[PDB]
Nucleic acid binder design. Structure first.
Ligand SMILES: [Mg+2]
Ligand SMILES: [Mg+2]
Ligand SMILES: [Mg+2]
Ligand SMILES: [Mg+2]
Ligand SMILES: [Mg+2]
Ligand SMILES: [Mg+2]
Ligand SMILES: [Mg+2]
Ligand SMILES: [Mg+2]
Ligand SMILES: [Mg+2]
Ligand SMILES: [Mg+2]
Ligand SMILES: [Mg+2]
Ligand SMILES: [Mg+2]
Ligand SMILES: [Mg+2]
Ligand SMILES: [Mg+2]
Ligand SMILES: [Mg+2]
Ligand SMILES: [Mg+2]
Ligand SMILES: [Mg+2]
Ligand SMILES: [Mg+2]
Ligand SMILES: [Mg+2]
Ligand SMILES: [Zn+2]
Lengths: 52, 191, 136
RNA sequence: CAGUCAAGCGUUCAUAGCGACAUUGCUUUUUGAUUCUUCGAUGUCGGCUCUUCCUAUCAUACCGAAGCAGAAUUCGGUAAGCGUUGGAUUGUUCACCCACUAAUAGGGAACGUGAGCUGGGUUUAGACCGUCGUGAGACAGGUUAGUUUUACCCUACUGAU
RNA sequence: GAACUGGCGAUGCGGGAUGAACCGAACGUAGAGUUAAGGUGCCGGAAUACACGCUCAUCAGACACCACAAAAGGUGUUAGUUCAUCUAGACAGCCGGACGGUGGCCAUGGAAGUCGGAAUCCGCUAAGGAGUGUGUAACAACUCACCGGCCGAAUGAACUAG
């Protein structure tokens, strides 16, 4: 359908991220602190929820 | 803690020539010449043996010292970019609607045309930064190559067309359509 | 206008504010129509919603057979009786206000139309046009 | 009105969305407590008209997250630029339904605004009923009728020499 | 609403921009000098004096009474505390191997380590587990955890307060 070789390439920019638990910011997958001033550069993070 | 001395090293290849005034750097290489400004960091420069340039900060703080290594990488990319060049291969991702990407020149601007993205009737035009070469390279399906001397223009323009193809009002985790960078390398890689 | 609005119409002078009683022009057995609202109308302080020719309205039957009483239903105005200016340049008006009963989709409850109908209303609701006798 | 912790709910899973047991705060659009100013009087409810301001944003603009396939929806951010209605009943503020709309968000300005209006209520004097009192009379119990004064001064504002 | 003292009322004066209560100090009319509390960028008289550090705020902070902010957080930055690892090559980053004794002994439909379960010692080398995960119903097959290859000097964990 979409030749899943590209999905990993495509998901790495859209799905393979991490989310700040306070300001819902989109972060790199291996981030330790959120890069946003309002949330106080908090360390509380969650992975971006995947399909299925 | 005011490190009284900090030093990082700038190796100079054979064929290049480096001209550095106060904070205006001029690198001359086979593929061209690249320059920019650095007057916003207050660093010193030292020529050693025509093949090695030294950069130092005296009595620098944590942030000040960290800025030095940024320049070390930054000017190095000029040297790499002027000897080997910069090549950014760029891949399409489409599920149902093939994306028609062409090159148009209105007023000689050499625009990049995007069509049929999610079946949209809108056409998205991305200007080509000067010094960046566009290649509808064959033998690999649905890929474009951007090449140039300065990594900044090559990288930013590559990112520019990436951002112009975002998807709105839909689940990006499902609608993976777009154009995404697949390979960052050198024009004269493996040389 | 609304769900059954097939196309757009130019603005025409409003002549039917809410609370007006309007003649029923079909064979559904209703005698008059009481306006309580107008579809697509805006909002403003103290501005009474007003109906015009071809506008779907929320109407109520005040005279007719009992099964049509005591309940609200959509309606479409087919005669205005207030002069309005067509963009061809003419001012025209009927002698009385008239309308029909229709579902929210615009399917008319009745089967026949008595008297003439306005061209704007007929051009906009296809179902009203079919049962219309004379259109002007 | 908003946080902090996290036993659980959520098919599995604390934190998509909720969240007990606790605990920290904010506001003065509620009601309280006090009597500091006013009893040689600052015209008390409500409605009508009108202007501006606050944001704790209902919608519209742009985004982030999901137990976001789509549509619909929910949580959140920047955001007060623009808009937030017509009616039945009640004096009502409040309340409840009908209907349209993108939505029918919440508040302040001496609980905005009576030399701007009205006087429906409260809140003089007339009168009726119920309960209470022997009685005169009492009732945030019910009902009906009951005078709304002045700007030519200064400033403010809109215009005008 | 009570106790002791000091104040205002009855009180001016310098300071707290402004104030009955605060700080300094209580008053005849004048002249000179020195100070109090308070200040010395300009308004404003007086050092843009000297010295050691901290802080960059896309709501900084700026002086008691006094005109406010907390719980909880922050590889922002600074200084510390306690643990460990390290040239017998520390952490990273990149590369390879990761073997035999013995598939240790049950669950036998199947367990070298991996649906599980009482267990658990050796030989080879600088190094590799009677095994960490991916994997097979098992086995290998990948991987780790350990060392080796490069690298050449500090690295990690927890906590405290400015
Ligand atoms: Mg009104
Ligand atoms: Mg009082
Ligand atoms: Mg009084
Ligand atoms: Mg008086
Ligand atoms: Mg007055
Ligand atoms: Mg806000
Ligand atoms: Mg108030
Ligand atoms: Mg008002
Ligand atoms: Mg007044
Ligand atoms: Mg009376
Ligand atoms: Mg009497
Ligand atoms: Mg009696
Ligand atoms: Mg009374
Ligand atoms: Mg006295
Ligand atoms: Mg005194
Ligand atoms: Mg003292
Ligand atoms: Mg001076
Ligand atoms: Mg703290
Ligand atoms: Mg700190
Ligand atoms: Zn954040």
């Amino acid at each position: 359908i979409i030749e899943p070789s590209l999905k990993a390439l495509a998901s790495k920019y859209n799905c393979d991220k991490s989310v700040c638990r306070k300001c819902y910011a989109r972060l790199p997958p291996r981030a330790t602190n959120c890069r946003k001033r309002k949330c106080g550069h908090t360390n509380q993070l969650r992975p971006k929820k995947k399909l299925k | 803690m005011k490190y009284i001395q900090t030093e990082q090293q700038i190796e100079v290849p054979e064929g290049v020539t480096v001209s550095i005034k106060s904070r205006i750097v001029k690198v001359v290489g086979p593929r061209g010449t690249l320059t920019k400004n650095l007057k916003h960091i207050d660093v010193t420069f030292t020529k050693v043996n025509n093949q090695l340039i030294k950069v130092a900060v005296h009595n620098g703080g944590r942030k000040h010292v960290a800025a030095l290594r940024t320049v070390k990488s930054l000017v190095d990319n000029m040297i790499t970019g002027v000897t080997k060049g910069y090549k950014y291969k760029m891949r399409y991702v489409y599920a149902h609607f093939p994306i028609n990407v062409n090159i148009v020149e209105k007023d000689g601007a050499k625009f990049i045309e995007v069509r049929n993205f999610l079946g949209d009737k809108k056409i998205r035009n991305v200007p080509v930064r000067d010094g960046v070469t566009i290649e509808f390279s064959t033998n690999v399906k649905d890929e474009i190559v951007l090449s140039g001397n300065s990594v900044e223009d090559v990288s930013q323009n590559a990112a520019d067309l990436q951002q112009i193809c975002r998807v709105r009002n839909k689940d990006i985790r499902k609608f993976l359509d777009g154009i995404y960078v697949s390979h960052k390398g050198f024009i004269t890689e493996d040389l | 206008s609304g769900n059954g609005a097939q196309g757009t119409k130019f603005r025409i002078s409003l002549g039917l504010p809410v609370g007006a009683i309007m003649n029923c022009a079909d064979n559904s057995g209703a005698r008059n129509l009481y306006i309580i609202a107008v579809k697509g109308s805006g909002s403003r302080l103290n501005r009474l919603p007003a109906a015009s020719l071809g506008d779907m309205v929320m109407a109520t039957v005040k005279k007719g057979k009992p099964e049509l009483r005591k309940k609200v239903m959509p309606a479409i105005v087919v005669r205005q009786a207030k002069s309005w200016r067509r963009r061809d340049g003419v001012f025209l008006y009927f002698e009385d206000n008239a309308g029909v009963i229709a579902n929210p989709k615009g399917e008319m409850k009745g089967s026949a139309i008595t008297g003439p109908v306005g061209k704007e209303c007929a051009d906009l609701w296809p179902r009203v046009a079919s049962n219309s006798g004379v259109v002007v």
